[PDB]
Amino acid sequence: IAVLSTLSRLLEPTSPQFVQMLSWTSKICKEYSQEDASFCKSLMNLFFSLHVLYKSPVTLLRDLSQDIHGQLGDIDQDVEIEKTDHFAVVNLRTAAPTVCLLVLSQAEKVLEEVDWLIAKIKGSAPTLLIEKAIVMQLGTLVTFFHELVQTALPSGSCVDTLLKGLSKIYSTLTAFVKYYLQVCQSSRGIPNTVEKLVKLSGSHLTPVCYSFISYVQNKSSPIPNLVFAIEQYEKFLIQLSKKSKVNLMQHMKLSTSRDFKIKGSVLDMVLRED
């Protein structure tokens, strides 16, 4: 495999040849298992190294994150899951330590890019198009994270590397929100794309994080870092909601924020009855 990588550096990334190499490395990841860790890691790197120069891995990560999630099981101790057909790599022995960290590492690279982009846009007092891209990217690997946060991971390094990645996505999200705090001062309206995948975090992410976070301390008997990144994320939605147009934060706390209840209201007492 070390030869195959050295040789595939010579392929023109645009070439019909390059495509073959990639699609074949997909086939090999697709149809074979081999619980030996050192290999599957190298195979995965090959695959990713090529994929990265074609289209962004976010789709692949989401796919693998569903195998890792399906094979190792869930936190609830009972939920039914699996999808094998994604990739034949990721066995029991494969995914738990190995594909897990390798997938996280890859996810962190995708975020450094989105970080880079968000950084680039703000640097400017064609651009709107980069914004829609930043979203789908984030949105996709939001589903990716939603998958591992439901997985029962080997506790040693896979718990903490997930927690690292988990707080990195919230930083990126935070700055993207902090980005629109710049753009909303001039005009102030929020693209559905942003509103929708802002509530994507309030449904598939934040609530799922919190239960993984408590699963970590019950299984036991980084963590405080995730918490911080989260609060700050909400903090700047708070600033963005009142400082642009829409209420973003009613997408996020859907449980506690409407709880304490009192019969009817003053509005209903007067307007309707007598």
Query: Token digits for 218?
Result: 């019950």
Specify the residue for token string 């001039």: 186
Resolution (A): 3.4
> Quick one: angle between helices 58-72 and 37-51, nearest 10?
150
**Burial class (CB within 10 angstroms; exposed 0-12, middle 13-18, buried 19+) of 113:** middle
DSSP result, the chain: -HHHHHHHTSS-TTSHHHHHHHHHHHHHHHH-----HHHHHHHHHHHHHHHTTTS-THHHHHHHHHHHHHHH--SSS-------TT-S---HHHIIIIIHHHHHHHHHHHHHHHHHHHHHHHT---HHHHHHHHHHHHHHHHHHHHHHTTS---TTTHHHHHHHHHHHHHHHHHHHHHHHHHHTTTT----HHHHHHHTTHHHHTHHHHHHHHHHHHHHH--HHHHHHHHHHHHHHHHHHHHHSSS--TTTT--SSSS-S--SS-HHHHHHT--
Placement of tokens 């968000």 in the chain: 118
* Burial degree of 186 (CB within 10 A; 0-12, 13-18, 19+): exposed
- Method of determination is X-ray
Residues of the chain immediately before an interruption (C to N > 2.5 Å)? 125, 221
> What span, in angstroms and rounded, lies between the C-alpha atoms of 108 and 114?
10
